[PDB]
Amino acid sequence: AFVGLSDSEEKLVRDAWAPIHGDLQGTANTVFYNYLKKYPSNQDKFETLKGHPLDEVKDTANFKLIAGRIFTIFDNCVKNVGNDKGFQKVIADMSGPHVARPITHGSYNDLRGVIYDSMHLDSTHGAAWNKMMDNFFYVFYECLDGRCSQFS
């Protein structure tokens, strides 16, 4: 279920994200690359990337757009980490385009893990980050299951 964060935890989440917030596109590019390199079955899910070598698409406009859009959603979630309706709406709106897509929970969680690993958080910041991400994927997975309206 969705579990609100305390004020101190909300601050911890902003602080944890601050390095990435200050280099959002560059971080996105590296993390998305590392995700597709470690879990290459996912590259085919992106029709604009399908059928080319990863190293051949990594430097392209389309690649960078996709990485950017993922990280902009997380950036807006962090922005709304103190506003549960706002946070839920950011996710609800991005969920629609994924509902029909054949993407496993495993694939989504593999991305979460690449992001976690890149951030190298201490356990206090990590605990707060994981409270936010647990909210993120509870809202997302409810929406993928056609129960998005509960957050409206």
Ligand code: HEM
């Ligand atoms: C859980 C973090 C994720 C976020 C925040 C996110 C966000 C977004 C956003 C903002 C878009 C653009 C609007 C649209 O959907 O067309 C997009 C599209 C898309 N996403 Fe995600 N996404 C996530 C995970 C994934 C994963 C793990 C996959 C595949 C393994 C995936 C596959 C897609 C596909 C295939 C599209 C359209 C691709 C194209 O332009 O070729 N998404 N996503």
